[PDB]
Design a protein around this nucleic acid. Structure first.
Ligand SMILES: [K+]
Ligand SMILES: [K+]
Ligand SMILES: [Mg+2]
Ligand SMILES: [Mg+2]
Ligand SMILES: [Mg+2]
Ligand SMILES: [Mg+2]
Ligand SMILES: [Mg+2]
Lengths: 66, 116, 153
RNA sequence: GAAGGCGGCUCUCUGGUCUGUAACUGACGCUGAGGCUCGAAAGCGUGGGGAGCAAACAGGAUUAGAUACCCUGGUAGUCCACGCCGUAAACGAUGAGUGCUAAGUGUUGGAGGGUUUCCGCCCUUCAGUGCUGCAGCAAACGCAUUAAGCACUCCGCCUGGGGAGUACGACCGCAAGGUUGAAACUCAAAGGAAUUGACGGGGGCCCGCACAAGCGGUGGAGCAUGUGGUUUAAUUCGAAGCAACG
């Protein structure tokens, strides 16, 4: 279905791993990253989100599990 | 001996379930299993065997003294539901449930399949 | 059969006691269509029961059937390389059939000189929970409880 | 990414590709034997390391046997650095390059335009990546702007099956063995695709004293009868799973 990206709608870019406020909504319980087909992001932005989230995880901003 | 509450550790597998009741900081308070009850062969892999295990462990634990438990599930098998129902029946109020099924994160090489 | 259940012909009551268990027991103990001999055997046996006990023979027989009728059968199931049993909640008719069968068989197995005496002694023993039929009941129930693990199957 | 192959994260160095741009060179290109380079996994050499897994191997089981499948252990090896090996169902089982040839649909990276408060939607276009499908092609299966169509350039390769990827020779390699590569003799077939059947310790649906539920029997005794062997002068001939044997 035609769905909208948060990022595109918000006109946000240069996704920093610090942005927990934006990254935490693309995460399901126990830290798993929501699929693109669930959320509705583009491939480029989705990959940037993956990298930012993994950075946040290693930097303690977000958990790997739980 | 007499305490308030602990945890329910239920290590269910394809061959056996092992129920273990422990204090929240870890030091155990009771345990039991199908072989302990007296099951053999494939009977160890049964919800009824898990039920009897939970019964015996809860009896001993209540004999020590407690009221409620948290539930820490782990492993395959179908004894989970029957054992939890039997915890409720024998008296322990099921405070909460969580599975801690270990996700290897691609960590180790598992063995071959049961053919070739 | 493949085409579903079959409804059975009704039971004819007993002329004197007006019961169905009695007539069906006649049919059980009968051999080669001899309702006359079977009925005479049964009525003389219940005459013995009236003789040695003031309770009604029908009530004593009801008590025996309550004490012999099982509740749980074992049913066989072949899971590949191992065939094993499964407990089974028994239908109320199957209960009575097995009861009459056990009673009559162990009665005629008893070592007395007439089927009258054999059956009467067996029924009284069953009503007092002492007979081979009750042993059979206990055996089936113990096996059901020993294989109780297969409640799911 | 040329392939093999490459998935945590950050940094250092580095390669190729795509889009527009139309400034510049001005046919400088393509293919490319022979050579050079890279090249899954196994494997070899030297030295580290070794959690788990695991050839070999041990024991238990199974089995008529089980030098196997199953189980419990477990060595090399799997891993790191260098140097060798250079093989694969190394497969899109389809060489590379260029052009032309209905359309549909998704999708990745862009660009342009017409809208849209932006987002977004729409139209066009390039480079890839999938599915459906017209023409045509195809022995058929199937392919079809990512061709197996129409065409052209070059390279590699085939001329029945086996013997045989063997032998001889040469080259390569520490070795294992690799690359090149026949003949004698032998068959009148080997093979591909598809069709009908049959079969399946393949699936689905259904049925039958088929199982289940039950009742009563045979097999044990004696006799009757028939049959097989055997004896016999002959023990007349026929009948041989179900479907021969009162
Ligand atoms: K080595
Ligand atoms: K078939
Ligand atoms: Mg290797
Ligand atoms: Mg197609
Ligand atoms: Mg049967
Ligand atoms: Mg016989
Ligand atoms: Mg006949």
């Amino acid at each position: 279905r035609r769905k909208v990206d948060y990022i595109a709608a918000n006109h946000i870019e240069y996704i920093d791993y610090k942005d927990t406020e934006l990254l935490k909504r693309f995460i399901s319980e126990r830290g798993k990253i929501l699929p693109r087909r669930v959320t509705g992001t583009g491939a480029k932005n989705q990959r940037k989100l993956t990298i930012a989230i993994k950075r946040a995880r290693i930097m303690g901003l977000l958990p790997f599990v739980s | 001996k007499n305490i308030e509450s602990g945890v329910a550790h239920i290590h269910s597998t394809f061959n056996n379930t092992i129920v273990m009741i422990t204090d929240t900081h870890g030091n155990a308070l009771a345990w039991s299993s199908a072989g302990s009850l007296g099951f053999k062969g494939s009977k160890k892999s049964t919800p009824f065997a898990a039920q009897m295990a939970a019964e015996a462990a809860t009896k001993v634990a209540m004999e020590h003294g407690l009221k409620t438990v948290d539930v820490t599930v782990k492993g395959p098998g179908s004894g989970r539901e029957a054992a939890i129902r039997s915890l409720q029946a024998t008296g322990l109020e099921v405070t909460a449930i969580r599975d801690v099924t270990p996700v290897p994160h691609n960590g180790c090489r598992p063995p071959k399949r049961r053919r070739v | 059969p493949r085409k579903g259940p079959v409804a059975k012909r009704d039971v004819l009551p007993d002329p004197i006691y007006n019961s169905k268990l009695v007539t069906r027991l006649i049919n059980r103990v009968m051999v080669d269509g001899k309702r006359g001999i079977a009925a005479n055997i049964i009525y003389n046996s219940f005459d013995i029961i009236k003789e040695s006990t003031g309770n009604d023979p029908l009530e004593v027989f009801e008590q025996a059937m309550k004490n012999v009728m099982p509740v749980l059968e074992v049913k066989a199931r072949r899971v590949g390389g191992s065939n094993y049993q499964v407990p089974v909640e028994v239908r109320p008719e199957r209960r009575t059939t097995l009861g009459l069968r056990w009673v009559v068989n162990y009665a005629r197995l008893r070592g007395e000189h007439t089927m009258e005496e054999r059956l009467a002694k067996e029924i009284m023993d069953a009503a007092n929970n002492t007979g081979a039929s009750v042993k059979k009941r206990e055996d089936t129930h113990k096996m059901a409880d020993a294989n109780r693990a297969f409640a799911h199957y």
